């Protein structure tokens with residue numbers, strides 16, 4: 356088991372989170388409470404080959420996804436709406452996920468995760484023209 360995405364990550368920066376949530380139509384007071392909650396984001400990943408288990412948690416809330424690169428799975432937008440998601444590799448250490456809402460119309464959502472050369476995990480989340488960036492380090 357060589358070094359890959361696998362491991363336990365804690366956030367150290369969080370740029371544009373508030374504006375992402377605005378685009379997704381979250382009200383001011385909840386955006387502010389979500390920004391506070393976001394400085395305790397922790398991520399646990401177990402990666403085997405193509406196949407991923409990911410646990411994202413804050414203080415009061417936790418979610419898990421399991422997916423295979425290339426195969427459709429069901430999950431949620433940053434704002435809770437169910438969606439069909441599909442993950443593709445973009446390079447050795449970057450994956451990108453396109454999301455389509457199960458029900459309704461709304462903004463085009465996507466995320467990426469990427470391991471950098473100096474051992475950080477970077478997560479981007481996109482809603483239309485707005486890009487949120489979160490940097491994590493090994494716990």
Ligand SMILES: *C/C(=C/c1ccccc1)C(=O)OC
Pocket residue numbers: 409410411418419420430431432433466468478480
């Ligand atoms: C890693 C991750 C990111 C994410 C961001 C926004 C919407 C859905 C997913 C995730 O969900 O892993 C559980």
